[PDB]
Design an enzyme around this catalytic site. Sequence first.
Site, PDB file in Angstrom:
ATOM      1  N   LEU A  31       0.864  -1.169   0.000  1.00 21.13           N
ATOM      2  CA  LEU A  31       0.000   0.000   0.000  1.00 21.13           C
ATOM      3  C   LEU A  31       0.904   1.224   0.000  1.00 21.13           C
ATOM      4  CD1 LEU A  31      -3.269  -0.315   0.249  1.00 21.13           C
ATOM      5  CD2 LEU A  31      -2.041  -2.253   1.249  1.00 21.13           C
ATOM      6  N   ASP A  32       0.344   2.380  -0.352  1.00 19.57           N
ATOM      7  CA  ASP A  32       1.161   3.590  -0.364  1.00 19.57           C
ATOM      8  C   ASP A  32       0.596   4.665   0.556  1.00 19.57           C
ATOM      9  OD1 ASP A  32      -1.054   4.409  -1.746  1.00 19.57           O
ATOM     10  OD2 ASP A  32       0.011   5.070  -3.540  1.00 19.57           O
ATOM     11  N   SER A  33       1.188   5.859   0.503  1.00 19.48           N
ATOM     12  CA  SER A  33       0.782   6.952   1.379  1.00 19.48           C
ATOM     13  C   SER A  33      -0.656   7.402   1.148  1.00 19.48           C
ATOM     14  CB  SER A  33       1.751   8.128   1.212  1.00 19.48           C
ATOM     15  OG  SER A  33       1.729   8.651  -0.108  1.00 19.48           O
TER      16      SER A  33
END
Lengths: 37, 85, 80, 98, 38, 170, 255, 73, 77, 494, 60
Positions: free
Chosen positions: B40-42
Amino acid sequence: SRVHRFLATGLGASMWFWIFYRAKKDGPVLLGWKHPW
Amino acid sequence: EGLQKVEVYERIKSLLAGFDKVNDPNNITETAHFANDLGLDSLDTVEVVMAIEEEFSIEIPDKDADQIHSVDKAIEYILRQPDAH
Amino acid sequence: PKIPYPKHVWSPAGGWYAQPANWKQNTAIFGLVIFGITAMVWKYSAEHEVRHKMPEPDRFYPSRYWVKQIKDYERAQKEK
Amino acid sequence: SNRQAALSLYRRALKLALDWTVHRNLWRGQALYIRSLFEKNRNVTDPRLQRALLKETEKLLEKWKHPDPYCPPTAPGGSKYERNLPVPNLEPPPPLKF
Amino acid sequence: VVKLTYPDRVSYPREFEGGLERELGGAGAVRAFLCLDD
Amino acid sequence: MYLSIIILPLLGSVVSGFFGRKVGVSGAQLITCSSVIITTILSIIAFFEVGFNNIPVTINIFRWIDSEWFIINWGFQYDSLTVSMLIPVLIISSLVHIYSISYMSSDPHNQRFFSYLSLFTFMMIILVTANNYLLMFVGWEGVGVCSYLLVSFWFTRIAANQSSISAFLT
Amino acid sequence: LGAGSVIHAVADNQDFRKFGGLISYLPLTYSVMLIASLSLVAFPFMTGFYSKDFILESAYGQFSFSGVAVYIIATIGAIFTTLYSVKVLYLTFLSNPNGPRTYYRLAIDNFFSAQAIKSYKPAHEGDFFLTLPLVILALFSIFFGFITKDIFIGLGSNFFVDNSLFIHPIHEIMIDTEFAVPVLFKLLPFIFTISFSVIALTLSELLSELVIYFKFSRFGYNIFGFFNQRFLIEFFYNKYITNLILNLGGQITKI
Amino acid sequence: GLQHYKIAMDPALVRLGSMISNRYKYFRWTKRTALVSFMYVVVVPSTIGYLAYKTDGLWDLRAKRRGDLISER
Amino acid sequence: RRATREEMRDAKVPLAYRDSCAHLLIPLNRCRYETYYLPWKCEDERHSYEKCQYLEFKKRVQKMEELREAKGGARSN
Amino acid sequence: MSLLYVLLIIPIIGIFLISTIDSFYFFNVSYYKKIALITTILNLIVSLIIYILFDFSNNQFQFIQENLDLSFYDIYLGVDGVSIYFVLLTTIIMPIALVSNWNSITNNIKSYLIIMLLLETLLLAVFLVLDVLLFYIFFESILPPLFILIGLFGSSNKVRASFYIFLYTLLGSLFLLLSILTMSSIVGTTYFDVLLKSSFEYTTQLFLFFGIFIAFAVKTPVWGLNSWLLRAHVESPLGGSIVLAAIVLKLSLYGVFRLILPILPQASLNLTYIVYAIGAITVLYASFSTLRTVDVKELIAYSSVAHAAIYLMGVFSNTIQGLEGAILLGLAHGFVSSGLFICAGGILYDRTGTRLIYFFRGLTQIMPLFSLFFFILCLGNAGTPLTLNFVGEFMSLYGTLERLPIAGMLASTSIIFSAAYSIYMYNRIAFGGSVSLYFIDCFRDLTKREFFILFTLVSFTVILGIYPSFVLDGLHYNISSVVYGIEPNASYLT
Amino acid sequence: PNITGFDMREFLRHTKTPTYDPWERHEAWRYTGRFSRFNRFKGALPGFGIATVAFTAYCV
Ligand SMILES: *P(=O)(O)OCC(C)(C)[C@H](O)C(=O)NCCC(=O)NCCSC(=O)CCCCCCCCCCCCC
């Protein structure tokens, strides 16, 4: 608890029958097709 | 009577299990960091929070929406608030 | 669940989740009081209920058995 | 700075859309337009326009602010908020002659 | 819109025999319609 | 009988609210609901007697204000209008009393609650059964205070507080 | 009362934005609210039909400018009466679910390993004390209108003969309410009721796009907000009535 | 003279009470403040008094039937 | 026949229906008194009362035919 | 010996009893309160015997005593219809006032008890004396005991309050005294029976009206002259506050029934538009400020200014309904004002040491009994029906409206505005949250003392609210004498 | 128009069910047999079907 569904349809069965039964007699009156007498 | 440990862990598990953007459903554990462990990312992290509160019927304030970055913290945060249904 | 609350706070309506072990005989004790003064009201009501039109004997009429303004009239009408 | 608040706009951006559109399958595709819109400004670095970009978007959130956003009942603005409140002080009062 | 386009009255004011003078409180009261203007 | 349907809803409420400690939650419900049910049954009787047979009935207990030309009595008049008014008031109040038995088994203060609804029922009979405008104003302000007391039933709701003010002040 | 059992089913939520389905979950609750709404919208031959509809003919029966003028005003109000009548029925019952899983997660699907005993709570209906008033009012909302139509309305009813409701012959409209009114106007609310409802049924769950298009237009945005916020009347009340009182008190007690 | 319960006395609240108590000592006459004092002490009661005088004895409902006037002057 | 006041006042009929067409109304009020105003027992004479009202109404509305003609179709209200 | 002089002396026995026991029995301070409490109950008993003998349909003053020893300033006592309920109210309140400070007075208990017992003798003498010079002798004699009482048992700013009650009363009374002295030089006496039957020139009546009205507008108090009340009704001890708002305020209303109505008929009839301007402005301004008041005691004090205007407009209405409702309003105001000061000044201030409403919130969670009574008292302050306060307001407002429609209408805003501050105060203290978080210590509810002085006070306002015929019956015949006017078909019957 | 790319037409154009999305699997359960369009309207009028059968019997 199937008794809830019976009451649901039972009132739903009491309704939708009072209309057509009443529309059979009072229906021609309010439409102006036949006077109440 | 209230929310339990097993109540929240599995129930929340079925939420992110539907992700097509995680690495794999087998990479989620009790201490699965949202970035390091599963992919997952920011920006996806807040999208998960939008899901969590919607299916927990609560609000996640912006102040407390940033310490939340792992599934382990999710378990302890929700059990802290008994407002959960 | 159950909300915590102080145990010192005396209420006339009972408090938080109030129910005594004797909620039945006490209910019966109070229930006699309501009945007792209800008929007490009913007596005074039956004595002061004033009317001007008298009912037909045939018609259904629950008050023909307790009120005064027509019970005397009915027996007065029973004289011919 | 310029990072914590940036996520907050996206936190409410899709939330605001859902409270306008009750059928959220419409909202489901609505977020993708919102999502891809954020992705376009990915490596914007200079704070001079980056701060101004956050100011501009905050203007349109107010321009599209809902007349009454959704809140869960046990929440500030919710229906059940502060409904059955326990007394803050459970200990009995001390011995005083009043 | 309604003021410019609204149907005129259909039925005449009801005619009451005697004008209901007595039953409506006597001459010192509002009376019914009895062969008046229209 | 006709003065009884004024007293019963009052009697349930004081026992529910002032002796609710001594009748408990279920006792407060049973007393007040029965009082409403009993008042319901006699109300339909009065409708069959006041209206169908055309007998209005007068009750004058005693004087309220007596100043020169001004003699306002605690007096009650049943006629065709007030029996018709008392049908929806008494049928629904009973049902709502039953509906609240299920509704508020989790709310702690459940016997202060059942007294207010039976205190509302009392003042609505006062309003419609009056001889005069001033006694009507008792049931008038009485339902207004009953409404404030119920709108701010969860008085830790600030929202209920402002709402109760608005209802009372308006 | 039908809404009250709805609130008990969910975790005391009151927003339509998270209501949906519940057809199988609350069968009895849906049935009564439909019965009540039909009498509310003056569906023909119901308890509310004789009472609500007769008004318009009585309003139109008084052949004056004001009577005809409010007939349009009442009818357009009756049109919007249909709109929210189905809106409550649609969003709560006749639509896709919009709440969380717990509102609908039944026990038919396992979906649980060690928490099978709890965590289901799938918005069941209430007990006897909650449902009995529903059934009792349901009968009245169907038949009570027809039974008492002669009792109150009739045509020459002598129920009110102790001068309880005084009516003056100079403005009698009872005979004109039944005779002089044209047949089209008598059944006109029925035409609008059956018609304007299906557009709502067409605009939601069939298209669900025109309402969204109308919302986001600048003209349509404000009309939603203006009506939502109660015509800004309380705004005009708080700022210029009560805050004024709270500042006159401030001027008097300080200056 | 007796002692009371223990209270979290808030200095901001405590000092706000001091100013409300002692506000009378700092009033001055200004262009604004004389206008406020003049409107509420002079003009407004003079307005009511003028209307009370101008409509005194003017009306009486006591038993005025149909065909008679409320006014008496 | 027409109902005179001395006999029609004792019937205690509403003011708005004191017209000369109320002869048939006095028996109608009795049946409602007889059967608690149930609208399925007094069907016959209920229609009988509406005879005179309906016949009177047509005589009344037909009077406008010359009345509004004299005004050239102007506004009578 | 007259029962009326029995009423005036029993408190003097109490003062003498209290001061000599230390010479008889370190006597416990509990004993002197026992004597003071019993002494007031005896006055209540005698006043109750007098009411059971009182005749409601007699013009002559009753329970008078032969003197035949005329000096220049003799003391004559009488009881008619208008003055008896005022006497009845005083003897009911005074026991409750002493009980309200049973624990709050610590030092100088002898002094506090002696002042109040003296204060009772002086207050009864006001409603009992039978001439206007005697009226003034006793209406101004209360100033020294009230001055010392406030500055000996008062709150922090008691010095300012004691100076305000003494210097406003003294000034207004001196304008009253110049009017009473003018009357005596014209009539040659002040005795009510002689003085009432004297007429006065129109100009004399106008100038006699002023001075008396200057005096009664200070002691009402009407708005703009009311700063002594906000200080001396807050800084006073609770018992002194109860006497100052239930009894002292009502001497001026009674002084209209002896000094303005029967001897200045023309003057009153022409000056009502001034009085109703002052009265309506008073209602209107005294309501808005009490809406913004932070001191809980000052809010209750300054609502009395709001209500005292309504019964001040009812006594100038020349209507038998207005005059009677005015007495009923000032009678009911004594019960509800007494209770509200007990609630604020006696129950909150004792527990918290503060009177700032900022510190109070949601006491209903902790004080169920206090919340109960503090709600009936708030309803009575708002003139809610079933309360004698409502009957007095309703009857005064009809009289005010019937006399001057615009003024009664502007008075009629009180229904809207008295409920505004009475319920806004109720929801801030009893409701509005769980409990105030400034309470670092939980509170006990009403004690038995508090529960019984409030139970009495709300009992009187409620019983006389269902059946106000108890007061209205004895008021009718004597208050008929204070109307001015005639009907064309009922005057000069031959 | 604006420094940020935001078109009303393009914003409103995407108001439809997306062909691709990372969220059907969490939102698929709603559009199943339990809450399908046909099943939702299966009991829109509960007793209407039964009542007509009795109604025709009364006529005959
Ligand atoms: P991760 O994704 O957390 O990393 C975030 C980073 C650090 C890259 C920041 O996003 C960042 O520094 N980026 C550059 C500056 C910035 O904040 N860009 C983000 C986009 S701002 C933008 O494009 C403005 C508009 C945003 C969308 C607003 C939508 C509002 C609602 C519209 C509909 C209203 C009616 C329903």
